Amino acid sequence: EVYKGDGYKVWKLEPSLGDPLELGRKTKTEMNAMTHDEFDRMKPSKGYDKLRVLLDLMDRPRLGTTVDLCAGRGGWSELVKDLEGPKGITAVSLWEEWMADPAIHRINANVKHLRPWQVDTLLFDGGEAFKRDQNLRKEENFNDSLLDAVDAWMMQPVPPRNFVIKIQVPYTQKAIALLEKWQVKTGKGRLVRLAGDRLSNTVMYFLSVRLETQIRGRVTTFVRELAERRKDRSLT
Numbered sequence: 001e002v003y004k005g006d007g008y009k010v011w012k013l014e015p016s017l018g019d020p021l022e023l024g025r026k027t028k029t030e031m032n033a034m035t036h037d038e039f040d041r042m043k044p045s046k047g048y049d050k051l052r053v054l055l056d057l058m059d060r061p062r063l064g065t066t067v068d069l070c071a072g073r074g075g076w077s078e079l080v081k082d083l084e085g086p087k088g089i090t091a092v093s094l095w096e097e098w099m100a101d102p103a104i105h106r107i108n109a110n111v112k113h114l115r116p117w118q119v120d121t122l123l124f125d126g127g128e129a130f131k132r133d134q135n136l137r138k139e140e141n142f143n144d145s146l147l148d149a150v151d152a153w154m155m156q157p158v159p160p161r162n163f164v165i166k167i168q169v170p171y172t173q174k175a176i177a178l179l180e181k182w183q184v185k186t187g188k189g190r191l192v193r194l195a196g197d198r199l200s201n202t203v204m205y206f207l208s209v210r211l212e213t214q215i216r217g218r219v220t221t222f223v224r225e226l227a228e229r230r231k232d233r234s235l236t
């Protein structure tokens with residue numbers, strides 16, 4: 001249909017030439033130098049609605065046994081509970097703080113330590129944008145390490161049938177390599193940029209929809225496009 005397709009709710013991202021790490025660092029550098037005004041112009045929980053959009057993009061799959069990594073205040077877990085009941089949903093976070101249905105089973109643990117188990121659905125909403133005063137590599141390394149935690153859940157003998165994985169910094173070499181590997185492991189997976197996400201971040205989501213390859217070139221298109229739209233939204 002005109003709805004099922006796009007680029008209505010996600011950006012159109014065809015592969016393009018270029019180095020996504022260099023372009024990503026470039027537009028991060030540009031954004032760090034913006035005035036308060038420029039940055040403003042460009043700039044149980046809200047995640048609930050976010051996941052709704054994402055799960056609708058995936059044609060509303062049956063979720064079954066679900067683990068929600070970095071569950072935070074619980075918007076995603078609450079959405080799963082409303083969709084299918086509290087029986088199949090497990091939330092993992094370091095407890096900030098739980099705003100969701102208290103009947104949802106929760107584990108207070110660091111997702112980097114916890115050994116994975118077999119799930120039907122894998123959710124991950126970890127990641128943090130760093131503020132301007134830091135060396136760029138600190139944000140890159142922090143979010144890379146977080147995604148590495150997701151790797152063990154993806155690479156187990158029976159991988160998740162559904163997954164929604166947030167990629168905070170999609171242009172690092174490790175992020176791209178991980179996404180390519182999960183595509184080989186699962187035979188699935190597409191990286192999307194939500195239309196209407198803030199331009200002040202670089203967030204994409206890896207969804208278990210039909211395989212879409214050439215992730216590196218599409219991340220390049222995404223970072224170039226993002227740099228353009230950040231520039232556009234300037235005074236005067």
Ligand SMILES: Nc1ncnc2c1ncn2[C@@H]1O[C@H](CSCC[C@H](N)C(=O)O)[C@@H](O)[C@H]1O
Nearest residue numbers: 045047070072074075076094096110111125
């Ligand atoms: N290493 C880690 N282990 C477990 N949780 C972590 C973590 N690093 C960050 N987090 C947690 O992950 C959460 C991500 S915010 C996720 C919000 C949630 N999806 C919602 O809709 O409400 C934060 O609350 C943070 O406390």
